[PDB]
Design a binder for this molecule. Structure first.
Ligand code: NI
Length: 119
C-alpha cells in the first residue's frame, strides 16, 4: 500500500539528506516514513490555507513558496537538527533538478492529500 507515495518520499528524502548533510556537516537521523506521513498530513491543510489549494495544476511558484514554510526540523531524518527549510535544498539544486524537485514535492503533497478527504 502507499506504493507511489513511497517512491516519491524516498526521492525527497535522498535529495534532502544529501544536501542537508553536505551543507551542515551534520549527520541525518533515521528515516521513519510512518512518522513523516503524519507530519505531511498536518502540513497539507496549513499550506493550502496559507498559500493556495494543492492541485495537479498548481503554479510552480506556489509550490516553491510552500517549500519556504516546510521545516526539516519537523521530519524524522532531521528532527530538531537545524532550522533548514525545504526551499534551502531547492536553492542548491541545479536548474534541471530544481524543476524535478518541485514536481516530486508537489506530487508527494497531492498523494498525502488523498488520505485526508473530509467527511
Ligand atoms: Ni504498502
Amino acid at each position: 500500500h502507499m506504493d507511489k507515495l513511497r517512491v516519491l518520499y524516498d526521492e525527497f528524502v535522498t535529495i534532502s539528506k544529501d544536501n542537508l548533510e553536505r551543507e551542515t556537516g551534520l549527520s541525518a537521523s533515521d528515516v521513519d516514513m510512518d512518522f513523516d506521513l503524519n507530519i505531511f498530513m498536518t502540513l497539507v491543510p496549513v499550506l493550502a490555507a496559507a498559500v493556495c489549494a494543492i492541485t495537479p495544476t498548481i503554479e510552480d511558484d506556489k509550490i516553491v513558496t510552500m517549500m519556504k514554510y516546510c521545516s526539516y526540523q519537523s521530519f524524522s531524518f532531521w528532527f530538531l537538527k537545524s532550522g533548514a527549510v525545504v526551499k534551502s535544498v531547492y536553492n542548491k539544486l541545479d536548474y534541471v533538478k530544481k524543476e524535478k524537485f518541485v514536481a516530486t514535492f508537489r506530487d508527494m503533497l497531492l498523494n498525502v492529500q488523498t488520505l485526508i478527504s473530509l467527511n
